[PDB]
Design a protein around this ligand. Structure first.
Ligand SMILES: [Zn+2]
Length: 258
């Protein structure tokens, strides 16, 4: 059967269809802050989202993706541990059924309520499909969400979820500015990893921001109203769509701050 986050098709079963699940550079991982190495050679991140053009929001059956026009670099990520230009193609979240879980990466074993993933691909490879086949093909910016004060810039996303409740549903979602989802500081940890959902390709340079953003209980509650199922099928609430931490193995996590 198709992979998912249930008891019979969850993360522990993925290796049967995707052997790379037991690979050498799988994600997510636990970030041990005392073992992370401060690297003074790491450059500051350069986030240019002023010309971003959002197009649509889609319920993929595993999460909801906000898609962007990536036919030109209008929204790009550069600098940091990256060499070259990476174009933003989509962002999505992972969340839990309770505020005490939901994030994929953890910090000193601490789990956050959710995790935002801004996915970018290396322009030198021409298209997203080619990029995922390369070790330096993608750059994913990870941002933790803690429950507290509401995040104004996230509300437009929250209000449209009713229209894409079930798998396969999509809605026009134009003029959304992703800058409203970024924390004040851009200090980060970085390590070589993989996509956290099948095909689990090891083509990602992970950039995880140290500063979480705050969202209200009401905002996260609305995420939990989505469905894994398609319309007309038995209702399965979309919650706990996160993969647990994987072995770090032969990898070093570097920090841009000390
Ligand atoms: Zn993700």
């Amino acid at each position: 059967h198709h992979w998912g986050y249930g008891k019979h098709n969850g993360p522990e079963h993925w290796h049967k269809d995707f052997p790379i699940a037991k690979g050498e550079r799988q994600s997510p991982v636990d970030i041990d802050t005392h073992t992370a190495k401060y690297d003074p050679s790491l450059k500051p991140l350069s986030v240019s989202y002023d010309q971003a053009t959002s197009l649509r929001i889609l319920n993929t059956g595993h999460a909801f993706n906000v898609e962007f026009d990536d036919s030109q670099d209008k929204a790009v990520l550069k600098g940091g541990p990256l060499d070259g230009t990476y174009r933003l193609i989509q962002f999505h979240f992972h969340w839990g059924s309770l505020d005490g879980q939901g994030s994929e990466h953890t910090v000193d074993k601490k789990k956050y309520a959710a995790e935002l993933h801004l996915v970018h691909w290396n322009t030198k490879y021409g298209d997203f499909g080619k990029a995922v086949q390369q070790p330096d093909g993608l750059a994913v910016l990870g941002i933790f969400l803690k429950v507290g004060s509401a995040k104004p810039g996230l509300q437009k996303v929250v209000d449209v979820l009713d229209s894409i409740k079930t798998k396969g549903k999509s809605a026009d979602f134009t003029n959304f500015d992703p800058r409203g989802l970024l924390p004040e500081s851009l200090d980060y940890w970085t390590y070589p990893g993989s996509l956290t959902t099948p095909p689990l390709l090891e083509c990602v340079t992970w950039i995880v921001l140290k500063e979480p953003i705050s969202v209200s209980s009401e905002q996260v509650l609305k995420f939990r109203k989505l469905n894994f199922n398609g319309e007309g099928e038995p209702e399965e609430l979309m919650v706990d769509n996160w993969r647990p931490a994987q072995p770090l193995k032969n990898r070093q996590i570097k920090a841009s701050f000390k």
